[PDB]
Design a protein around this ligand. Structure first.
Ligand SMILES: [Ca+2]
Length: 302
């Protein structure tokens, strides 16, 4: 087919071709292609790419969108726990997911690493912060009605506003195991009481960035999975450190370009996703030079 073509693009490390090439293929087409390639060459397509092109945010976005979604969420979690835990990356993978998605993950993990996902969290992730409770509860509780809207709206405007130290497990559970419809209400109630949006109240209350972000992600998910994905991309765009912002931006693009392709509709809250991609990602560092376009391509914003 055109399998030989890409196969030559990857050896030549012609990052520019790879983008256009990848622009043609669709979700299912891609999976097909990936296995076809491995038969016609004897090379597992992803690892072959992760070994052919530079290394960094560009390689990241390509080695992510070019793969099976859950498979990726697995490699993201795998890498996120190495040294210190990349709460931003773990959060992304398990907060912006449907019950079925986390399920397929627990499964894909158990068979890629051998161990059960929920256990590794207990081992590697001590339960200290809102950040760590988010990682856990996201895989233990399921959204279910409490029928105490006004009651819960107080639970937040107290733990995020009045209380000295916010009961983290308390607040993470309220958001995680909350029904999307009850949450529309809870949230609306909170704005009335406090006069400020939960997002603000979170970011204002949690100095640690990973914790304010993780909480804000969970919160925006209960209001629209693409909104959670928008907030995340925005948090990546406004990050001053290039290695971090490109890292974050690559992952989020790589894990959600298809799943929540209309995230740019919600990004309007902060500006124009397409404009902000064109503006923010101007780096000249080799491994970052093409990310801008790989990113635009996977969001059909080009
Ligand atoms: Ca490489």
């Amino acid at each position: 087919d055109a399998i030989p073509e890409v196969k030559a693009i990857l050896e030549a490390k012609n990052e520019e071709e790879l983008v256009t090439f990848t622009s043609r293929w669709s979700a299912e087409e891609r999976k097909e292609l990936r296995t076809q390639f491995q038969d016609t060459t004897g090379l597992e397509f992803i690892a072959f790419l992760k070994k052919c092109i530079k290394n960094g945010p560009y390689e990241d976005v390509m080695a992510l969108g070019w793969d099976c979604n859950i498979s990726a969420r697995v490699n993201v979690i795998k890498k996120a726990m190495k040294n210190v835990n990349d709460f931003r990356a773990i959060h992304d993978v398990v907060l912006i997911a449907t019950p079925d998605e986390r399920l397929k993950l627990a499964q894909a993990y158990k068979e890629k690493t051998g161990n059960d996902l929920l256990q590794d969290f207990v081992d590697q992730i001590p339960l200290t912060s809102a950040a760590s409770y988010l990682c856990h509860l996201a895989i233990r509780e399921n959204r279910t009605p409490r029928g105490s809207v006004a009651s819960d709206a107080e639970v937040l405007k107290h733990n995020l506003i009045d209380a000295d130290e916010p009961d983290h497990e308390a607040v993470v559970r309220l958001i995680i195991t909350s029904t999307a419809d009850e949450y529309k209400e809870i949230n609306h109630r909170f704005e009335v009481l406090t006069g400020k949006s939960v997002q603000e109240a979170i970011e204002t209350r949690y100095a640690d960035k990973e914790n304010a972000r993780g909480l804000c992600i969970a919160h925006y998910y209960n209001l629209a999975p693409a909104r959670a994905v928008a907030y995340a991309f925005h948090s990546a765009v406004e990050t001053q450190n290039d290695d971090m912002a490109y890292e974050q931006a690559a992952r989020i693009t790589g894990l959600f370009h298809d799943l929540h392709k209309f995230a740019w509709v919600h990004y309007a809250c902060w500006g124009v996703m397409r404009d902000d991609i064109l503006s923010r990602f101007q780096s000249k560092e080799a491994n970052k030079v093409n990310f801008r376009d790989a990113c635009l391509m996977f969001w059909k914003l080009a």
